[PDB]
Design an enzyme around this catalytic site. Structure first.
Site, PDB file in Angstrom:
ATOM      1  N   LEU B  20       0.824  -1.204   0.000  1.00 26.42           N
ATOM      2  CA  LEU B  20       0.000   0.000   0.000  1.00 26.42           C
ATOM      3  C   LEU B  20       0.862   1.259   0.000  1.00 26.42           C
ATOM      4  CD1 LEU B  20      -3.068  -0.682   2.335  1.00 26.42           C
ATOM      5  CD2 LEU B  20      -3.030  -0.375  -0.149  1.00 26.42           C
ATOM      6  N   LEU B  22       5.157   2.834  -0.124  1.00 23.04           N
ATOM      7  CA  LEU B  22       6.388   2.727   0.646  1.00 23.04           C
ATOM      8  C   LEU B  22       6.455   3.850   1.671  1.00 23.04           C
ATOM      9  CD1 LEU B  22       7.129   0.573  -1.404  1.00 23.04           C
ATOM     10  CD2 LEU B  22       9.368   1.662  -1.671  1.00 23.04           C
ATOM     11  N   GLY B  23       6.670   3.483   2.932  1.00 15.34           N
ATOM     12  CA  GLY B  23       6.812   4.449   3.997  1.00 15.34           C
ATOM     13  C   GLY B  23       8.226   4.991   4.090  1.00 15.34           C
ATOM     14  N   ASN B  25      10.283   4.328   6.911  1.00 10.02           N
ATOM     15  CA  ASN B  25      11.125   3.366   7.611  1.00 10.02           C
ATOM     16  C   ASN B  25      10.792   1.920   7.265  1.00 10.02           C
ATOM     17  OD1 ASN B  25       8.809   2.874   9.724  1.00 10.02           O
ATOM     18  ND2 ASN B  25       9.242   5.078   9.799  1.00 10.02           N
ATOM     19  N   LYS B  27       7.715  -0.799   4.827  1.00 12.43           N
ATOM     20  CA  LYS B  27       6.704  -1.030   3.807  1.00 12.43           C
ATOM     21  C   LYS B  27       5.318  -0.999   4.436  1.00 12.43           C
ATOM     22  CE  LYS B  27       7.264  -6.060   4.218  1.00 12.43           C
ATOM     23  NZ  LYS B  27       7.589  -7.324   3.498  1.00 12.43           N
ATOM     24  N   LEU B  91      -6.494   5.034   3.610  1.00  8.15           N
ATOM     25  CA  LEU B  91      -6.828   6.288   2.946  1.00  8.15           C
ATOM     26  C   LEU B  91      -6.611   6.124   1.448  1.00  8.15           C
ATOM     27  CD1 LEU B  91      -5.392   8.967   5.404  1.00  8.15           C
ATOM     28  CD2 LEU B  91      -7.549   7.692   5.450  1.00  8.15           C
ATOM     29  N   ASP B 136       4.689  18.616  10.802  1.00  5.43           N
ATOM     30  CA  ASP B 136       4.986  18.150   9.452  1.00  5.43           C
ATOM     31  C   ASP B 136       3.772  18.292   8.541  1.00  5.43           C
ATOM     32  OD1 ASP B 136       6.708  17.290   7.512  1.00  5.43           O
ATOM     33  OD2 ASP B 136       6.586  15.158   8.024  1.00  5.43           O
TER      34      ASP B 136
END
Ligand SMILES: CCCc1c(C(=O)Nc2cc(S(=O)(=O)N(C)C)ccc2C)cnn1-c1ccccc1
Lengths: 346, 345
Positions: B20, B22-23, B25, B27, B91, B136
């Site tokens: 879903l 790539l983050g 830190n 996946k 989301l 952020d």
């Protein structure tokens, strides 16, 4: 060489297995890691979208060629550059490795009350680093507290060579960040002959001594008000050197003021530190002190050593002012990646 | 009051190999709860003192519809790593400005930009009321729930979140001496003030489709020597309200303390009575459409400039000069000894 895939910073990383424990840093795509072949703890930077536009592809070749030539203990120094691609056909990614640092002045100023002895050694290596970078014809153009990394103990290294070039008579105007830019940039278009960074350190030197900003210019015009408030309005002898007509009418519209004695504004500061600031914040660019002369100042009698302030071999342009295709800059960048020889850690 | 379930995730959920995105830190994986057939997402978030304080804050902000709902958090082991498995609401609406990016024919109105800002404000007003200073807030952290127009804008990316002290600044006086007094260190003043800074940028982006900073600069609200009218250039800022054009000035104030607060922003007339807002057409849909490649750089420079508005509390303190040592320090101090022995003979 052999690489291993890893998902970091919203992308996939495949770097040599000599770098272990890749961990992100934050806003900064850089990763903190440990180098096995050198025994050091280094940082690896992933250039996000290095070749997307002619400006980006050209700037990558210009940037990479600069880090190659930088060999100081107070300037950032490229330890290793690599790419997972085996041939040019599959070349679409590049990485950069350098020493891990720990902090930057900007966050240090907002966090620590720096002492007079701190400013002596912090500004010294900047000027000692300023002598090197200026030895080869170049202008850093982006000297500011967020571009000087500082280690845990006291070592600092200059960063962000993105906007730097061999000095020429005419060049791109409106370059440096305003709060740490010289009054020459907007007053004279192709001015700023290797003096903004010296002026920038003067702004930076007063940042460490105070904790606030010297010239926090709200708009572009407010910068000219806050600067001329301290350095005084230029006299007719200097007012002829102004290029623009609409600018000259503006300077003649403010209330005329002279230079105030810098010792009246910086309370408790070292008189030698104030004496250096008076030399680094002179309106006359031709009369402002140079980095080579700044090291001989009595403010650095504790750290000045004229035999350990090395200079550079001059860096020639050789392709930096040409205009080619996207693929040409991608190949010219490739030729400089394989030609990189890492230095031995003596 | 959140309790981290310590049991394996596969006992309650079904983890799949479908990615879903790539983050930062790790996946992000698709995940379903068998007892509800409820699709979710999965965050790795390796365990550390930073991770447990973030989840503690993202848990408290879950009871706010404009903030993504944490469903539960596990503490298991993946790939031999002590990890804090995080399950979230999926989301699917995409980025906030990607929804404005693809617009068929209906032009973007200033009223539409009001309930969007009122939505983001309700999230920041909730976070600041319980003293969690997210820092952020940028376009890539504002996702919609679905492609359907009924989607709800949500705030994500709590990586830089921080609990702060609810200490209103005492608002520096108009009469100051000539000399610059030594600053008293108040680093917490950049916690909440950084939030509103993003509000002005996002509000500025929405109205014109581009950010204030030209390039390697910040918050300055120019490839030629402009002398005036650089703040909101007329080609796209002509039909913008004066009350709105000056609200951005308060939010993008260079001074953190003098900056407008979240209680004032939510009480401003353009935000309070958002229903009776002028219906002037904008140029966002066209300005963003003019260059998709430049838009990615917009996300880059905003992230870099965001670091100057926030404080990296996870950085070292410079030691006193006598307590520190480095190659250049001993290169000078050992040379100092050479003169001593040389002076002897
Ligand atoms: C953005 C700073 C990241 C950082 C660095 C760094 O950015 N190193 C670096 C620079 C260039 S660069 O000068 O050429 N440039 C920016 C484009 C190219 C390659 C690396 C690998 C070092 N420490 N921290 C650092 C800072 C604070 C705490 C811990 C570490």
């Amino acid at each position: 060489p052999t690489f291993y895939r890893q998902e970091l910073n919203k992308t996939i990383w495949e770097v040599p297995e000599r770098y272990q424990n890749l961990s992100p840093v934050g806003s900064g795509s850089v990763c903190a890691a440990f180098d096995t072949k050198t025994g050091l703890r280094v940082a690896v930077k992933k250039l996000s979208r290095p070749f997307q536009s002619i400006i980006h592809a050209k700037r990558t070749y210009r940037e990479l060629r600069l880090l190659k030539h930088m060999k100081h203990e107070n300037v950032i120094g490229l330890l290793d550059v690599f790419t997972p691609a085996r041939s040019l056909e599959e070349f679409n990614d590049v990485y950069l490795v350098t020493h891990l640092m720990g902090a930057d002045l900007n966050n240090i100023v907002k966090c620590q009350k720096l002492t007079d002895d701190h400013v002596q050694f912090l500004i010294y290596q900047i000027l000692r680093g300023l002598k090197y970078i200026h030895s080869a014809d170049i202008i850093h153009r982006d000297l500011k507290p967020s571009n000087l990394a500082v280690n845990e103990d006291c070592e600092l290294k200059i960063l962000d060579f993105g906007l730097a070039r061999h000095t020429d008579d005419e060049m791109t105007g409106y370059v440096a960040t305003r709060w740490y830019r010289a009054p020459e940039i907007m007053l004279n278009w192709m001015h700023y002959n290797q003096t903004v960074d010296i002026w920038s350190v003067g702004c930076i030197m007063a940042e460490l001594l105070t904790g606030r900003t010297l010239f926090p210019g709200t708009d572009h015009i407010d910068q000219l008000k806050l600067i001329l408030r301290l350095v005084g309005t230029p006299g007719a002898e200097l007012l002829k050197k102004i290029s623009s007509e609409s600018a000259r009418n503006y300077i003649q519209s403010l209330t005329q003021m002279p230079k105030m004695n810098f010792a009246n504004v910086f309370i408790g500061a070292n008189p030698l530190a104030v004496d250096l600031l008076e030399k680094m914040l002179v309106l006359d660019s031709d009369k402002r002190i140079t980095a080579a002369q700044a090291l001989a100042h009595a403010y650095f009698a504790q750290y000045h050593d004229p035999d350990d302030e090395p200079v550079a071999d001059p860096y020639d342009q050789s392709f930096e002012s040409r205009d080619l295709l996207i693929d040409e800059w991608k190949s010219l960048t490739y030729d400089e990646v394989i030609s990189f020889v890492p230095p031995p850690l003596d | 009051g959140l309790q981290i379930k310590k049991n394996a995730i596969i006992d309650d959920y079904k983890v799949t190999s479908q990615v879903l995105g790539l983050g930062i830190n790790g996946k992000v994986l698709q995940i379903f709860n068998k007892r509800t057939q409820e699709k979710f997402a999965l965050k790795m978030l390796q365990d550390c003192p930073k991770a447990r304080r973030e989840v503690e804050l993202h848990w408290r902000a879950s009871q706010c519809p404009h903030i993504v709902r944490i469903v539960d958090v596990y503490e298991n082991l993946y790939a031999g790593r002590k990890c804090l498995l995080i399950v979230m609401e999926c989301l699917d609406g995409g980025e906030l400005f990607s929804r404005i990016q693809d617009r068929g024919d209906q032009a973007f109105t200033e009223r539409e930009a009001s309930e969007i800002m009122k939505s983001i404000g309700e999230a920041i007003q909730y976070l600041h009321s319980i003293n969690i200073a997210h820092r952020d807030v940028k376009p890539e952290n504002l996702l919609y729930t679905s492609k359907r127009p009924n989607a709800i804008l949500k705030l994500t990316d709590f990586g830089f979140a921080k609990e702060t002290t609810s200490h209103n600044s005492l608002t520096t006086p108009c009469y100051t001496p000539y000399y610059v007094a030594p600053e008293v260190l108040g680093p917490e003043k950049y916690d909440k003030s950084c939030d509103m800074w993003s509000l002005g940028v996002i509000m500025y982006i929405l109205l014109c489709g581009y950010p204030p900073f030209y390039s390697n600069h910040g918050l300055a609200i120019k490839t030629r020597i402009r002398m005036g009218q650089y703040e909101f250039p007329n080609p796209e800022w002509s039909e913008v309200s004066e009350e709105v054009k000056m609200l951005i000035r308060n939010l993008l104030k260079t001074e953190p303390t003098q900056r407008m607060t979240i209680t004032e922003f939510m009480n401003h007339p353009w935000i309070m009575q958002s229903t009776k807002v002028p219906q002037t057409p904008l140029h966002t849909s066209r300005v963003l459409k003019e260059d998709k490649e430049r838009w990615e750089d917009v996300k880059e420079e905003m992230t870099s400039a965001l670091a100057t508005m926030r404080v990296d509390y996870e950085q070292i303190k410079i030691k006193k000069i006598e307590d520190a040592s480095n190659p250049l320090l001993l290169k000078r101090r050992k040379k100092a000894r050479a003169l001593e022995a040389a002076a002897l003979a």
